[PDB]
Amino acid sequence: XRXXX
């Protein structure tokens, strides 16, 4: 959290 999370 989609840095990828």
Q: How was this structure determined?
A: NMR
Q: Which two tokens stand for residue 1?
A: 């959290």
Q: Which two tokens stand for residue 5?
A: 């999370």
Q: Which two tokens stand for residue 3?
A: 């840095």
CA Rg, the chain, in Å? 3
Q: Which two tokens stand for residue 2?
A: 């989609």
DSSP 1-5: -----
Distance CA 4, CA 1 (A): 7
Neighbouring residues of 2: CB distance < 8 A, sequence distance ≥ 6: none
